[PDB]
Swiss-Prot record, chain A:
Compartment annotation: Postsynaptic cell membrane
Residues of the full protein shown: 765 to 862 of 1007
Family: Belongs to the glutamate-gated ion channel (TC 1.A.10.1) family. GRID2 subfamily.
Record text about domains: The PDZ-binding motif mediates interaction with GOPC.
Role this protein plays: Member of the ionotropic glutamate receptor family, which plays a crucial role in synaptic organization and signal transduction in the central nervous system. Although it shares structural features with ionotropic glutamate receptors, does not bind glutamate as a primary ligand. Promotes synaptogenesis and mediates the D-Serine-dependent long term depression signals and AMPA receptor endocytosis of cerebellar parallel fiber-Purkinje cell (PF-PC) synapses through the NRX1B-CBLN1-GRID2 triad complex.
Disease tied to this protein: Spinocerebellar ataxia, autosomal recessive, 18: A form of spinocerebellar ataxia, a clinically and genetically heterogeneous group of cerebellar disorders. Patients show progressive incoordination of gait and often poor coordination of hands, speech and eye movements, due to degeneration of the cerebellum with variable involvement of the brainstem and spinal cord. SCAR18 features include progressive cerebellar atrophy, delayed psychomotor development, severely impaired gait, ocular movement abnormalities, and intellectual disability.
Quaternary state and interactors: Tetramer; dimer of dimers. Interacts with EML2, MAGI2 (via PDZ domains) and AP4M1. Interacts with BECN1, GOPC, GRID2IP, SHANK1 and SHANK2. Interacts with CBLN2, but not with CBLN4. Interacts with CBLN1 (via C1q domain); the interaction is CBLN1-NRX1 complex formation-dependent; CBLN1-binding is calcium-independent; CBLN1 hexamers anchor GRID2 N-terminal domain dimers to monomeric NRXN1 isoform beta; promotes synaptogenesis and mediates the D-Serine-dependent long term depression signals and AMPA receptor endocytosis.
Protein name as catalogued: Glutamate receptor ionotropic, delta-2
Gene name tied to this protein: GRID2
The species this protein was found in: Homo sapiens (Human)
Transmembrane segments: 67-87
Length: 98, 49
């Protein structure tokens, strides 16, 4: 969505504005402007700037990262069962019978 | 169509070197004026080594 352009700005009543615009138009016709343009935006960059095809998951497989949160549901049960089992030593001091 | 085939990434593609097809795609590739990323992507698929 271009439309607008970059420009050089001047005080009102500067006479040089016309000389600048003339020389800029000459440089645009004379091709020199295309050299300075190419100089700073050379096409042959390191990588494609535009492709986002760029995908990580391809095999659709579940793996030891994506699934692994479920294992914390097991671990909670393991820990809680260990904690509860050790309450034998707390209660059996005075349970009345073991 | 040429657009998707030039913008997909699963299928490698090319031609016979020194052909008019190769010279045409090289001309569209090397030129910094050329506009559609089609031609740069085709050249980048070709210009691998």
């Amino acid at each position: 969505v271009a439309d607008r352009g970059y420009g050089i700005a001047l005080q009102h009543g500067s006479p040089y504005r016309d000389v600048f615009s003339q020389r800029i138009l000459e440089l645009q016709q004379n091709g020199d402007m295309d050299i300075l343009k190419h100089k700073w935006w050379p096409k042959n960059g390191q990588c494609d700037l535009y492709s986002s095809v760029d995908t990580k998951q391809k095999g659709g497989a579940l793996d030891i990262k994506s699934f692994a949160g479920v294992f914390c549901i097991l671990a909670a049960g393991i820990v809680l069962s260990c904690f509860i089992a050790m309450l034998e030593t707390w209660w059996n001091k005075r349970k009345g019978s073991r | 169509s040429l657009q998707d085939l030039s913008k997909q990434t699963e299928i490698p593609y090319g031609t016979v070197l020194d052909s008019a097809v190769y010279e045409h795609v090289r001309m569209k590739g090397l030129n910094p004026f050329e506009r559609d990323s089609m031609y740069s992507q085709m050249w980048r698929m070709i210009n691998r080594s």
